[PDB]
Structures are given as C-alpha cells and as structure tokens.
C-alpha cells in the first residue's frame, strides 16, 4: 500500500478552465498531497479530482484500484490517482 | 494492494532489441501477467523486466513501491511495474 497524506495546508483545491477542440467548456479541480515513495521524505504530488467530488480532508489515505488502467501499449498506467481513507 | 498473477503459461520472457539514437545497443525483456482491476475477470498486462533480472516464476505477487515516480507534470506515474511475492 501506498501511503498518501493530505496536510492541513493542502485542504483546498484550485480550478483550471478552458475550451475543448470542438467547443465544449471544461473545468479541472486540482489538489496537492504528499506520497511516500520510500525516500528520506515524502514527495509533493498533484491530484486531479473527479467531477462532482469535494477536496479530500486532511488525513491519511491509500490508493483505490480504480486509479489504474491498461494503456495503449499494453502496460499498466495511472489514469487518475483516486484516494480512499486509510 | 494490487493482486498480480503470473500463470503457468506466462513463465517465460521474450526479448526485443535495437540501437539508441547515438549508437548504443539495448535489450528489453518482456513478460505477460494478469492484474485484477476489479472487473469480472483479471486483465492481460505487459511487464518490462529490469536489467539482470530473471522472469518472475508462476504465482501471486503485489506491486513494489519502486514502480512509481513523479512525472514531468507533477502527477504520479508508473515507471515500470516491479513485483514482489505476495
């Protein structure tokens, strides 16, 4: 299991916006977190939230299976890092 | 934890080869496996092995933390799926 932490300072998201190739509006909500990759300290990682989802509250989390998909070259990839409480 | 299985039919690797941009030879060893992504059946995934490593034997495995890295856009990515016995 991957240990992910939302610190008290990371309790909000920001939103970026634009227009798609064929005219549709989009909005993306992004939040920061710390992921422990086994180095001396955890590293900073950007998370893009799914539609209609609030910012994750401060606390400890792990990664949900729905974060992964098989890519176009047949290898596993992360689609979007989706988190669940630890 | 991600459940990965090497079936008895997947106990070998194949090797692809070529030459890099500035003249160096390379070889890549690839093995197939099944990863349970929570659908009705596990899906087929290609794994590229690290230098000097043998094919994983048939059995159950999970994913090692060293499989992940932060990408050039600041989001988590899989570098290479590295497996450890379950």
Residues on chain A bordering chain B, Cβ-to-Cβ distance under 8 angstroms: 1-2, 35, 37-38, 43-48, 65-66, 68-70, 73-78, 81
The DSSP code sequence of B16-53 is: EEEE-TTS-EEEEEEEEEEE--SSSS-EEEEEEPPTTP
Q: Which two tokens stand for residue A10?
A: 């990371």
**B19 vs A41, B24, B46, B51, B52, CA distance in Å?**
37, 6, 22, 16, 19
- Taking an 8 Å cut-off on Cβ atoms, the answer to whether B74 and A35 are in contact is no
Give the position of tokens 């240990």: A3
> Could you say which architecture CATH assigns to the domain A1-86?
Beta Barrel (2.40)
Method: X-ray
Residues on chain B bordering chain A, Cβ-to-Cβ distance under 8 angstroms: 1-2, 35, 37-38, 43-48, 65-66, 68-70, 73-78, 81
Own/partner pairs for A43-46, CB < 8 Å, 24+ apart?
A43/B70, A44/B70, A44/B74, A45/A4, A45/A81, A45/B70, A45/B74, A45/B75, A45/B76, A46/B73, A46/B74, A46/B75
């Amino acid at each position: 299991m991957i240990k992910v932490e939302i610190k008290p300072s990371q309790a909000q998201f920001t939103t970026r916006s634009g227009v798609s190739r064929q005219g549709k509006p989009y909005s993306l909500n992004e939040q920061l977190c710390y992921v422990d990759l086994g180095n001396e300290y955890p590293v900073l990682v950007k998370v893009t939230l799914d539609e209609g989802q609030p910012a994750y509250a401060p606390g400890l989390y792990t990664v949900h299976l729905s974060s992964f998909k098989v890519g176009q070259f047949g290898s596993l990839m992360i689609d979007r890092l989706r988190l669940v409480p630890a």
